[PDB]
Amino acid sequence: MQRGDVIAILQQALETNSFRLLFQPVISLRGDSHENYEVLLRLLNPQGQEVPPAEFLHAAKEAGLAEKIDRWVILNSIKLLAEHRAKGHQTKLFVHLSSASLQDPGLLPWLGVALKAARLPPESLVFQISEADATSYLKQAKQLTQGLATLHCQAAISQFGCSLNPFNALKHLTVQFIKIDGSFVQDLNQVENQEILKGLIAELHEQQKLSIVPFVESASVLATLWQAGATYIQGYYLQGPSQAMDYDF
Amino acid sequence: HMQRGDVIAILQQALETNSFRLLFQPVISLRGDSHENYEVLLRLLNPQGQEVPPAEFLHAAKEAGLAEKIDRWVILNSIKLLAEHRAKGHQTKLFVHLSSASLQDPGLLPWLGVALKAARLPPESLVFQISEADATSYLKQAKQLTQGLATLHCQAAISQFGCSLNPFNALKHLTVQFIKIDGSFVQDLNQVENQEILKGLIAELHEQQKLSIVPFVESASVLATLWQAGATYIQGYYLQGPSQAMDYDF
Ligand SMILES: [Mg+2]
Ligand SMILES: [Mg+2]
Ligand SMILES: [Mg+2]
Ligand code: NA
Ligand code: NA
């Protein structure tokens, strides 16, 4: 019961609408009152056991289902936002887009329709694409990001800073948030890493981006990142992924 | 609380109370190999019994200078489990991850010899798995570590292989028997092009005398493609996901 054909389990989670959505809050250090949450996707097998994320994420690609799962995630997110601005909550969701989605001319038209249906507050959704993907497909990244702006969505680049000249890719994109890569967060006891981190963050602030620094695993890491100038932070010390959007912002 | 905490503090205490959990994911032979082979994976529960996401505690470890201590905990507990799983007809081999902090520590190798001296394991019971990026950043220490492992009758693997500028260059200077191909090569295998690249890569690994391991077998169609390509070993949830027990039927 810790095995299965993940490609078939995915084909059917889709058909029973049975993925599980999790939410990991993004914490504002500089006065953002939104309830920002990153959306994460989980999958259970028929026997109710969780399939390792790396495995079903790789399955989804092996099956050519990435884009179709993105649409399920987007529609269910749109749903939840509609149901959450129901109360006072200023919820904002960070939703991942696969490379397959990025390369797809059809995403934008499709999205415009769904958003119209839902009638959500503007700037309710942020689409997050990896640095590697934006860099592979700069032209499509450029097209997609301008498009989102017309729809009153925002964009984020994640795993930022690992490429040789990472700020170049940002030249023609419309992106408000930049989530720095996890590697920058390691061993900040070494003054040199504090400086690398600090200059990355300052360079981002200089290009007028909002920095998001992940993997805050204790209060000292949090304090260090606050001093370094981080706009937002995320990590288990604040809250790990949860099935509910119940974080006290 | 239920789903938050200071993971650095949790790690420091987990180390002291031995309350990490080891899981095992079978590495499965297509070329007969006698062994039960398992990859060792580390899990962590918070004090309230809820699982801390591995990426979060692996980062916490690096943030607190605890990576090598965690590796040593895993090694000792892996040695322990092997000696016990020997209590049966199980010719088990374990793949154990080494962090870049361990790879860099010249203290590692003599410490390893003491750990092994005490446990009386069959030779070639442990394979130490280093990522390509780590091996490539620290090639001198990887050369030294891997020659040393052979002296200790251990083996070595490079994982996420095939992503660096010239992947086969690093291999010239290391003592490594297993090569675990990066998952990037296992995508879109639907496409004949990607099948041929993978097939070629595996063939080249064979030429260079390495045993290839291909991860992310997520269905029969993927297994089917990999079979054809002559992979020495495979791994994935379609065969068996990580489990708390070494009870796969090889
Ligand atoms: Mg299938
Ligand atoms: Mg996250
Ligand atoms: Mg594994
Ligand atoms: Na945008
Ligand atoms: Na700082």
Residue numbers in the entry:
A (entry chain A): 438 to 686
B (entry chain B): 437 to 686
Paper text:
FimX (PA4959) from P. aeruginosa is a 76,000 Da protein identified in mutants lacking twitching motility in response to environmental factors. FimX from P. aeruginosa contains a CheY-like response regulator domain (REC), a PAS-PAC domain commonly involved in environmental sensing, and one GGDEF and one EAL domain. EAL domains exhibit phosphodiesterase A (PDE-A) activity and are responsible for the conversion of c-di-GMP into 5′-phosphoguanylyl-(3′-5′)-guanosine (5′-pGpG). FimX-EAL displays a central barrel composed of 8 β-strands surrounded by 7 α-helices, with a αβ(β/α)6β secondary structure succession.
As a conclusion, we bring here the first high-resolution structure of an EAL domain complexed with 5′-pGpG. The 5′-pGpG was formed during crystallization by either the very weak phosphodiesterase activity of FimX-EAL or by spontaneous hydrolysis of c-di-GMP. Residual density in the active site of both EAL domains of the asymmetric unit of the P43212 crystal form leads us to place a molecule in the active site. First attempts were carried out with c-di-GMP substrate but yielded very poor fit. Instead, the accommodation of 5′-pGpG, the reaction product, in the cavity was much better and acceptable. Density is clearly defined for 5′-pGpG phosphates and sugars but not for the two guanine bases. In the complex form, two 5′-pGpG molecules are inside the cavity. The small diameters and the charges of the channels prevent 5′-pGpG molecules from escaping the cavity, trapping them inside the dimer like a bird in a cage. The magnesium is coordinated in a tetrahedral state by Gln461 (β1) and Glu475 (β2) from the EAL motif (turned EVL in FimX), a water molecule and the 5′-phosphate from 5′-pGpG. Interestingly, in the complexes, the 5′-pGpG conformation is very different from that of the c-di-GMP preventing clashes between the two ligands inside the dimeric catalytic pocket.
